[PDB]
Amino acid sequence: SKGEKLFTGVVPILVELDGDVNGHKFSVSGEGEGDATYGKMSLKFICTTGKLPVPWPTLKTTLMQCFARYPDHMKQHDFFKSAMPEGYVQERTIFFKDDGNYKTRAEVKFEGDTLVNRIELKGVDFKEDGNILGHKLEYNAISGNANITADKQKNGIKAYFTIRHDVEDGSVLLADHYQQNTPIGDGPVLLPDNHYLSTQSKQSKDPNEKRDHMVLLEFVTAAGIPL
Structure with a gap:
């Protein structure tokens, strides 16, 4: 893919999110750099509207699979870079067990040399005293697998x-x-065989930062197809 060539170096990242969870509006900005050669992203997120009304951990997956490291033998399965620079729409529903759901829609595309992720999130049916609106979640690192499958009907992936x-x-x-x-x-885009993306994450706070924020160091690797 031609899009793959846009990721061979360090790429500036910009993230924008507008959210509404049970009517509680908020916005998040982020910035950083991605180095897909090494599956790396270095990011810092800020809540631009004051305090976040949901826990940072619940927004991490919403807040750029294009920065995954695909091993050479799997490069034909990298949909995400193949859609660049025009980009892709990423939609999710996230069902929280015995609580509400988030519906997200994002556009991930280049704006010049910057990879921009613009997101709208709507959360409904949350428990005002539950683990999410009650802020009862540990601020720790999320690591694990995202299972990817082709979606030929939509010329994309699920x-x-x-x-x-x-x-x-x-x-x-x-x-x-x-x-x-x-x-x-x-x-044209690449439609992949089944595989997964493996995420390793380190989450921290900036001791000099007074705004509500999250610092992440993420490593994302494609896997599940043998050499």
Whole structure:
């Protein structure tokens, strides 16, 4: 793919999210750099509207699979870069077990040399005293697999996976993700064999930052097809 060539170096990242969860409006900005050669993203996110009304961990998966490292033997399965620079639409529904759901729609595309991820999120049916609106989730790192499958009908991909969010009481809040991606442009894309993306994450705070924020260092690798 021609899009693959746009990711061989370090790429500036810009993220914008407008959210509404049970009527609580908020916005998030992010910035960083991606180095897909190494599957790496270095990111910092800020809540631009004050305090986030949901836990940072619940937004991590919403807040750029184009930065995954595909091993050479799997490069024909990288839909995400093949859709660049025109980009793709990424939609999810995230079902939180015994709580509400998030519906997200994002456009991921280049604006010049910057990879931009613009997101709208709507959350409904959340429990005002639950683990999400009650802020009862551990601020720790999310790591694991996103299962990718071709969606030939939509000239794109679907993904599915469950995030296990640690709760402050030792329990787990399951977040069941259903994902659809469709190219924005009408140029040809790569439709993959089944595989997954493996994410390793380190989450931190900026000790000099007074705004509500999250710092992430992410490594994402495609896998599941043998050498």
